[PDB]
Design a protein around this nucleic acid. Structure first.
Lengths: 64, 388, 49, 201, 334, 263, 121, 49
RNA sequence: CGAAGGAUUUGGUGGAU
């Protein structure tokens, strides 16, 4: 997230620093924030440990 | 125990099949392709070089092959035997491209044009019994450009189209060539006279032909030419080849090929004037492997196909314009089929086990849904699409 | 009990292991088979064995 | 997740569609809206027989009471018809389905449905509904003229509507609204009208 | 659909099994008025689909049979849900089965000297191994290929056991096929070698040496190609016959080789030295060969409705048999 | 393999009808033997195939895998009428005597048709007939009283009795030809078999076993047992001269080949 | 896009995108605004290529300030998608830098385009 | 006019639709809390469209 | 090399031991 957040910070910062007619709204920052949150959500949703699956033993059946 | 709301529950109980039958549907499935391999076309009489060009006869069940072997081998594709009808060795004339031609007015007129890295073109008249019964072949050499030799260095890249001379309403064939500096030279198919020439800025990379019907028995032939940068010119060949439209391929760079599909074209030729139809698709290849697809109905591409990672060497639509086959000669097995208008690549075919080799030629039969793919080893492999 | 042409074979359902076979081949192909405890009724042509 | 696996999707048909039937039956509007979401997604994922689609319409419209369910339902009906890609894709609705639809959706309602600019693609359903009107309702021939103006229909769909309207003139008495429908087709794409006349009469 | 069988579950669950002539078996839950599961193509439709399907009394096992010479058993495992077990029904699971050829066998051979097994090929494009003991065991050879639909029906077959478990020990010839496929008894699977005629002809004969190191293939064009079983590499090629080679045999000593063809000549070769010891012409075309290695006598079924016995040592006809009124399909030595 | 899927001369032997595949669609063409016609009937469906081809005295009866029989007029180049059996099983064989028309399905069901009336007269199945790939109707007078049918063995069936009359031990492989050379002598051949068995209809004993050099594809008989020409699978033609006169097994007397000048 | 200046013409854009393709094959190309920023700091950049259609354009306007200080030519091309494909990647690229290498096999072509960009400025 | 012309006309008439892939609705869980049913269905339709 | 993919691991049954 630090790598992603730093990249989006530069985009927002460069918009602020080099603007002739920037509106004092932060719209670029807000849209950049949503991208980092989306990156965080999918990244956090990841499960490093493999999920165990439903074991289905074909148990031996003998007639009665 | 012993409209209604419970309708949905009942219909599920009746049947255990829930996928609609594809036999009734006239539109092929988006993601699943029913394709079956047949016998190779070149098996009966193998070729001694790469299959540079492939062409099905517009009506008869014949397949024409060519290459640097300098032989025009014609096979009778039946799908089970594929015996060779005839062969014609052209001494010192490598074949970079060959094609059948049938006059749009005089259906009895059949003809084969072949060309290579030479300053001449060969025409082979197959009319009447020349194809099979005749002991000898009626061959003519086109070698005269009528003062325009400087523009043209080789006849190797050419295509054949139909031009309707509007003021007389007569319709005849034209042979289109690629020049040294954006030059497209247009010749009369039979007489060989130089009719007109079209010029574009930059190096000409590829061109294609589109037909626009006007009225009953009237149609206009448009020449579409593209530059390596991606700028596209559209010339009206019925008005001395004057530019009528200019546009650019969005995001285009290093363009390699251009093609149209969905109507009449070299792969889906017409048999009469009323069969002329306008093409609704346009695809632009590139060295990077991108294929921008445009809807002919600055333009914005409908899709940017990117499955292939090498230069596009063949772009071809199915006769009905529902499949786009894009292939590359750079690497082995570089061939994909794209479903239109979904623009989704078919997944089941080709597989790792599908034998394609260095794909260097592709052809769709006018009818029957057969696909022929030639490779650098000289083998033409034949597949059938069960939907057609 | 399964019919095999002119003879019938008895398998143990627990293991599908062959247990018994008909001693002799019937003169005609068997058409119907009925099994009741230790006795199996085989029908062929106009005779029931 | 099962989109690629067509066989697994087929095994999912009995279960989830059954659940949709139960959810539609529940008087709660939220349950009906949930059933609509499942049906629209499943239709896109896997094509189904028109009979399944038509049966789905009967269940959706049978218990359609809430206004919010009505809005979601109408969008659902149109999307299911879009998924249909066989012969009879734009054939007229059955008599029972046609009567059920108009009762739960007055013609003025669909005109409002067509009025909004952001309407989803609904040409196949409107083509089906338009042919349903002509077969069963003669007074409604005028509302057809408004419907065609509001929504553009595909070329073959227009041909099918023209094909039926030709039969209407031969059977049904000539009407100002009926000829006006023809004159509307005279104004737009005159040649295709002749082809329908040439093929039919 | 057409119903061919019906049966009810007596294990305490209200289940009805419906068999159809299409080869389907459907299970319904009478209490819930729903379909539990459908078993597809358990039995062939061409042979009547599901002729009979019976739930065993008081057990979750169902036995199915058909006209394809197959008997199968399926078990309904206990529901894996602690509650609402009736809703969560495990699909039926394949348990065990017995079977055989669906069409009359085309070729047969005894697998081993003990006479405990036999190899069988049928027009249904399958090779089967049948036990001759009470166990009645039957196993189909796996056709899964090695890497380095069913195959066409087998027209010829040869087998040896000198090198069983070391490498391939069976050679089979297929109809309208220009190569012969190898198999392995020990693995009970198709082999890893394919032997080609190398003369654009169909394989008409296959033979093996007693040592198990050489495989012989006779083509329809008259060429005899000799391969090595261990490596599947062509070693020698004899070209004497001009018509099809209908029989190849080699003696137990691997010295004298005999071949016969439709041209009617019987060729004698020296396998070690690769020389033509002699050539014998018969009145009629030769259809088959059987070689008796202990006595060095081989019999030939001639087109004139006779069996000609020839001794390889002196290359002369010793016995000629007459009496058959039509073509001799097959014959063997005691 | 040969491109020509099926072929049949007309009774006069002057016109040959052959069916071949163009791309995926079978086309039926007719040529004059004694001496080019560019016109072929085209089957519009890839699935449709011609299983049987029989001349009629200028029409040809074409059996199809669809389960229906087409009557084709060569001059008009259009299917004049189609005889449809109730079932959908492919027609295995067809034979004709005047107005009589008998076919057999893959379901082993016989059918009877009248060309003049265009009607399905009767359909029946005879037990002990587990397959039926060949049907031949005996030239007995002007009416059909019995039929020769063969799948692997050969059977004689009486139409009125609707039961078998006699059984001949046939070839191991499916029977490919069942032509009746003369009265009480009919020849039989099988797929991939070099042997032709001549059986006696009344007695049932194999009179002779003619042998060809290779597998037999087609069979033609001349006059009344005068001469028999069989086309071998290797591409040669063998002629048997007076095969109905050692004695058990006979070999062809004359062999005919075609070779180009080059070789 | 008034801020994008100088914007190369159609004839010059093709030449620039031609050199970019060759540099990509020879591993002489640094893709992205951030790497292009680094190359200016290390003084290993022949010149910088930027895409005029980038929205917001500001994310690459810092490069002209660095380029002018370091005396490195820079130029704008009309399309970032075209720049991306020329670079040899599946994603759009807004900026790129041609790394300096006096032993390169395409050295003459880089200097020819560099001179044309200098004239343009 | 001919039937194949009508068939090709029907083929041309048909238009593309956005297919549903594996990763199309995964983000729904992220914004599944405190969301009205109608809005959820509208978002589903928007993704489908 | 190559007709509607390839590698590794693993549960159960059937047959010998």
């Amino acid at each position: 997230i630090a790598r992603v957040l730093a990249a989006k910070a530069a985009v927002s910062l460069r918009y602020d620093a080099l603007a002739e007619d920037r509106d004092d709204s932060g719209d670029i920052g807000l849209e950049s924030r949503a991208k980092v949150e989306n990156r965080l959500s999918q990244l956090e949703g990841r499960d490093l440990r493999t999920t165990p699956k439903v074991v289905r033993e074909a148990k031996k059946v003998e007639m009665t | 125990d012993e409209g209604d709301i419970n309708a949905l529950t009942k219909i599920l109980s009746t049947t255990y099949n829930y996928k609609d039958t594809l036999s009734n549907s006239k539109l092929l499935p988006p993601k699943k392709l029913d394709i079956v391999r047949l016998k190779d076309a070149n098996a009966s009489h193998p070729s001694h070089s790469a299959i540079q060009s492939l062409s099905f006869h517009p009506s008869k069940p014949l397949l024409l092959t060519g290459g640097y072997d300098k032989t025009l081998r014609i096979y009778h594709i039946d799908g089970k035997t594929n015996h060779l009808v005839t062969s014609l060795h052209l001494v010192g004339s490598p074949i970079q491209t060959c094609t059948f031609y049938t006059s749009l007015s005089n259906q009895n007129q059949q003809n084969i044009f072949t060309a290579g890295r030479r300053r001449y073109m060969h025409s082979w008249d197959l009319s009447l019994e020349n194809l099979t019964h005749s002991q000898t072949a009626k061959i003519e050499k086109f070698s005269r450009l009528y003062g325009h030799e400087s523009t043209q260095r080789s006849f190797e890249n050419f295509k054949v189209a139909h031009l309707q001379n509007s003021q007389t309403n007569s319709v005849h064939g034209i042979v289109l060539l690629q020049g040294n500096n954006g030059w497209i030279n247009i010749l009369h198919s039979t007489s060989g006279l130089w009719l007109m020439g079209c010029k574009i800025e930059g190096v000409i990379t590829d061109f294609c032909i589109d037909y626009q019907p006007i009225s009953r028995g009237k149609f206009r032939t448009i020449l579409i030419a593209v530059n390596a940068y991606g700028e596209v010119w559209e010339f009206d060949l019925n008005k001395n080849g004057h530019v009528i439209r200019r546009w650019k391929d969005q995001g285009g760079v290093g363009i390699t090929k251009i093609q149209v599909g969905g109507g009449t074209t070299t792969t889906c030729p017409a048999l009469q004037i009323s069969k002329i139809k306008q093409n609704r698709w346009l695809a632009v290849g590139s060295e990077s492997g991108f294929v921008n697809l445009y809807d002919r109905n600055t333009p914005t591409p409908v899709a940017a196909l990117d499955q292939l990672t090498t230069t596009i060497s063949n772009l071809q639509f199915s006769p009905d314009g529902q499949i786009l086959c894009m292939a590359s000669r750079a690497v082995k097995d570089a061939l994909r089929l794209v479903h239109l208008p979904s623009c989704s690549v078919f997944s089941n075919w080709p597989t790792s086990g599908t034998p394609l080799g260095k794909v260097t030629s592709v052809a769709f039969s006018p009818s029957g849904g057969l696909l022929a793919v030639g490779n650098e080893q000289g083998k033409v492999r034949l597949w059938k699409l069960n939907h057609y | 009990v399964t019919c095999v042409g002119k003879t019938f074979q008895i398998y143990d359902a627990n293991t599908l292991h062959l247990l018994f076979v008909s001693e002799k081949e019937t003169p005609s192909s068997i058409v119907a088979l009925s099994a009741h405890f230790h006795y199996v009724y085989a029908a062929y042509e106009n005779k029931v064995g | 997740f099962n989109s690629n696996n067509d066989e697994k999707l087929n095994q999912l048909v009995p279960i989830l569609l059954e659940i949709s039937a139960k959810l539609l039956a529940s008087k709660s509007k939220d349950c009906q809206i949930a059933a609509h979401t499942i049906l629209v997604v499943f239709a896109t994922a896997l094509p189904l027989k028109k009979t399944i689609i038509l049966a789905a319409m009967e269940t959706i419209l049978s218990n359609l009471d809430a206004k919010e369910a009505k809005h979601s339902a109408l969008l659902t009906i149109c999307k299911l018809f879009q998924t249909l890609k066989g012969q009879g894709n734009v054939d007229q609705l059955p008599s029972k389905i046609f009567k059920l639809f108009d009762s739960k959706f007055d013609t003025v309602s669909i005109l409002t449905f067509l009025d909004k600019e952001d309407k989803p693609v609904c040409d196949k359903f409107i083509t089906s509904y338009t042919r349903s009107i002509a077969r069963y309702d003669r007074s409604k021939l005028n509302i057809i003229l408004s419907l065609l103006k509001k929504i553009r229909l595909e070329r073959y769909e227009v041909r099918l509507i023209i094909t039926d309207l030709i039969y209407l003139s031969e059977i049904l008495e000539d009407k100002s609204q009926l000829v006006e429908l023809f004159e509307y087709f005279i104004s737009i794409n005159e040649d295709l009208v002749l082809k329908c006349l040439k093929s039919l009469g | 659909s057409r119903i061919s069988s019906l049966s009810f579950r007596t294990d305490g669950s209200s289940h009805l099994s419906v068999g159809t002539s299409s080869g389907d078996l459907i299970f319904y839950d009478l209490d819930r008025r729903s379909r539990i599961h459908v078993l597809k193509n358990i039995h062939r439709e061409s042979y009547g689909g599901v002729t009979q399907a019976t739930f065993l009394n008081g057990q979750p096992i169902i036995v199915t049979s058909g006209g394809d010479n197959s008997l199968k058993e399926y078990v309904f495992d206990p529901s894996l849900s602690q509650g609402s077990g009736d809703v969560v029904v495990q699909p039926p699971r394949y348990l065990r089965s017995r079977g055989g050829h669906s069409q009359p066998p085309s070729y047969i051979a005894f697998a081993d000297s003990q006479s405990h097994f036999m190899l069988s090929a049928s027009k249904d494009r399958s090779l089967w191994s049948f036990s001759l003991r009470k166990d009645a065991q039957s196993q189909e050879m796996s056709q899964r290929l090695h890497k380095k639909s069913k195959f066409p029906e087998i027209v010829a077959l040869a087998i040896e056991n000198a090198r069983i478990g070391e490498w391939e020990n069976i050679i089979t010839a297929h109809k309208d096929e220009k190569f012969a496929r190898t198999w392995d008894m020990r693995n009970k699977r198709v082999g890893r070698w394919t032997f080609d005629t190398t003369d654009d002809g169909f394989v008409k004969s296959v033979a093996m040496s007693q040592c198990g190191n050489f495989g012989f293939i006779g083509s329809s064009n008259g060429s005899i190609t000799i391969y090595n079983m261990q490596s599947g590499i062509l070693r020698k090629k004899y070209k004497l016959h001009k018509r099809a080679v209908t029989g190849i045999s080699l003696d137990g000593m691997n010295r004298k080789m005999v071949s016969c063809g439709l041209d009617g000549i019987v060729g004698f070769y020296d396998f070690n030295k690769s020389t033509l010891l002699g050539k014998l012409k018969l009145d009629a075309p030769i259809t088959a060969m059987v070689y008796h290695r202990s006595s060095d006598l081989f019999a030939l079924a001639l087109d004139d409705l006779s069996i000609v016995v020839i001794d390889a040592v002196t290359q002369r006809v010793v016995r000629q048999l007459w009496g058959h009124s039509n073509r001799i399909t097959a014959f063997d030595f005691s | 393999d040969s491109p020509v899927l099926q072929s049949a001369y007309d009774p006069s032997g002057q016109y040959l009808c052959y069916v071949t595949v163009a791309l995926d669609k079978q086309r039926v063409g007719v040529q004059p033997t004694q001496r080019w016609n560019e016109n072929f009937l085209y089957l519009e469906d890839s699935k449709l195939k011609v299983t049987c081809l029989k001349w009629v005295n200028v029409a040809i009866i074409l059996g199809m895998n669809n389960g229906e029989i087409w009557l084709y007029s060569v001059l008009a180049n259009e299917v004049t009428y189609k005889f449809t059996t109730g079932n959908s099983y492919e027609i295995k064989d067809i034979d004709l005597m005047g107005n009589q028309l008998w076919c057999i399905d893959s379901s082993d069901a016989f059918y009877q048709f009248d060309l003049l009336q265009f009607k399905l007269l009767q359909h029946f199945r005879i037990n002990n007939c587990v397959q039926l790939n060949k049907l031949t109707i005996v030239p007995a007078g002007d009416s059909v009283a019995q039929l020769l049918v063969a799948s692997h063995s050969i059977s004689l069936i009486d139409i009125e009795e609707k039961k078998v009359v006699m059984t001949f031990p046939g070839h191991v492989s499916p029977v490919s030809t069942l032509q009746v050379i003369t009265n009480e002598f009919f020849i039989s051949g099988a797929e991939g078999d070099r042997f032709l068995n001549v059986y006696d209809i009344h007695s049932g004993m194999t009179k002779c076993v003619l042998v060809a050099e290779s597998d037999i594809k087609e069979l033609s008989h001349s006059g009344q047992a005068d001469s028999i020409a069989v086309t071998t699978e290797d591409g040669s033609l063998e002629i048997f001269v007076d095969p109905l006169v050692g004695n058990k097994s006979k070999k062809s007397s004359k062999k005919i080949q075609i070779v180009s000048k080059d070789g | 896009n008034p801020k994008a200046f100088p914007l190369a013409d159609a004839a010059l854009t093709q030449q620039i995108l031609d050199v970019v393709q060759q540099a990509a094959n020879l591993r002489q190309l640094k893709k992205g605004a951030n790497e292009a920023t680094k190359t200016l700091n290390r003084g290993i950049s022949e010149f910088i290529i930027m895409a005029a259609d980038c929205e917001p354009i500001e994310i690459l306007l810092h490069l002209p300030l660095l380029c002018e200080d370091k005396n490195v030519p820079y130029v704008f091309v009309p399309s970032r998608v075209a720049l991306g494909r020329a670079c040899g990647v599946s994603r759009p690229v807004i900026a790129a830098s041609i790394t300096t290498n006096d032993a390169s096999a395409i050295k003459t072509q880089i200097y020819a385009v560099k001179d044309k960009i200098e004239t343009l400025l | 006019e001919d039937e194949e012309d009508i068939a090709l006309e029907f083929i041309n008439g048909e238009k593309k639709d956005k297919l549903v892939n594996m990763n199309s609705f995964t983000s729904m869980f992220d914004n599944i809390q405190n969301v009205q049913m109608d809005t959820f269905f509208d978002r589903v339709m928007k993704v489908l469209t």
